[PDB]
Amino acid sequence: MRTFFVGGNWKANPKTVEEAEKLIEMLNGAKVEGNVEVVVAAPFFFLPTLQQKLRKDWKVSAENVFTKPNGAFTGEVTVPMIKSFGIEWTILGHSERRDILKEDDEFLAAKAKFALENGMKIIYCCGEHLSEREAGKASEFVSAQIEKMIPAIPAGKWDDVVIAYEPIWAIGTGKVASTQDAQEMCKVIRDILAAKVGADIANKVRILYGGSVKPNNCNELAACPDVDGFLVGGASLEPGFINIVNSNVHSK
């Protein structure tokens, strides 16, 4: 069985270091049940304190990184900077960056290749928008994205990739995703991997559900056979995060 994986994405939160420290102390006291690999992603500015203070059985992640080691890229944070502090993970391709910050697939593949070649592990995000969901073309859209991702992955690095499916069509659209939606698209992704890079890899890669995950739906989502975990949004800031981490006991 693949090890269940839960990434907590704080996004651009909290507002103060005092709040981030309080949240860390809450995470540190949580009793994890079952078996699960937990990663916490936070704003660059809080990454030093998170790495220093977060429980050592969990790992810290950046929410984005640039494509280069360093250079004339005012405002950007790079792989060597966060790796120099012991941070092993980054999220790439999150819907908010693809959209608001206009990150395209070419930019994202470069990031994934550079990050992996430089020893990082990645949570690579994908997912289709409302028009493609409505048109019933969700699998084609998601395939194209995964197909741009695939050649970024060096030989031997699939152990360092996790994929998160975001139902962007259910974010701020008036539509909601069902548990079966989540299962279906995670299976779509697994099958794309099997067809393109082989069953051995497909059978080991964790594919996460990245839509709305809360204490009230995490257990039924975890039980879906192709859902290997979550990239959690707003609940990653709340005590409910632990219920989600613990939903691993319902996945087999």
Q: Closest distance between a copy of itself and the C-beta of residue 132, in Å?
A: 21
Chain centroid to Cα 101, Å, comes to 18
For residues 24 and 192, what is the distance between their CA atoms, to the nearest angstrom?
37
The number of residues that bind a copy of itself (CB under 8 A) is 45
* CA neighbor of 113 nearest in space, from 99, 130, 93: 93
- From residue 55 to residue 74, the character string flagging contacts with a copy of itself as x (rule: CB under 8 A) and all else as - is --------xx-x-xxxxxxx
Asked about 94 being catalytic, the answer comes back as: yes
CB-wise, 31 or 84, nearer to a copy of itself?
84
The b/e string for 192-225 (b: 16+ C-beta within 10 A; e otherwise) is bbeeeeeeebbeebbbbbbbbbbbebbbbbbebe
Of 49 and 139, the one with the shorter C-beta distance to a copy of itself is 49
Establish if 215 lies at the interface with a copy of itself (CB under 8 A). no
Min dist. Cβ of residue 191 to a copy of itself (A):
27
Instruction: Tell me the two tokens of residue 73.
Output: 């890229």
End-to-end CA distance of the chain: 7
Work out what residue 156 binds among Na ion, a copy of itself, none; the CB cut-off runs from 5 to 8 Å by kind. Na ion
The 3-state DSSP class for residue 1 equals coil
Candidate list 82, 122, 182, 222; residue touching a copy of itself; CB under 8 A: 82
Nearer to Na ion by Cβ, of 22 and 137: the residue is 137
> Scanning residues 98 to 137, which ones bind a copy of itself (CB under 8 A)?
100-102
- Binding partner of residue 247 among a copy of itself, Na ion, none, CB under 5 to 8 Å per kind? none
- Map tokens 């809360």 to a residue: 214
For Na ion, which residue has the nearest CB? 251
Alpha carbon 215 to its chain centroid, in Å, reads 18
Residues that bind Na ion (CB under 5 A): 136, 156, 159, 227, 251
Three-state DSSP at 217 gives: coil
Site string for a copy of itself, 4-43 (x = CB under 8 A): -----x-xxxxxxxx------------------------x
Query: Which of 6, 24, 40, 47 forms a contact with a copy of itself (CB under 8 A)?
Result: 47
Return the SS3 of 91.
strand
Q: How far is the CB of 59 from a copy of itself (least distance, A)?
A: 17
Spatial distance between the Cα atoms of 113 and 184, rounded to a whole number of angstroms? 28
Is 250 part of the annotated catalytic residue set?
no
> What single string gives the DSSP state of each residue in 160-198?
GEEEEE--GGGSSSS----HHHHHHHHHHHHHHHHHHH-
Q: Which residues bind a copy of itself (CB under 8 A)?
A: 9, 11-18, 43-49, 63-64, 66, 68-78, 80-82, 84-85, 91, 94-97, 100-102, 233-234
- Active site residues per annotation: 94, 166
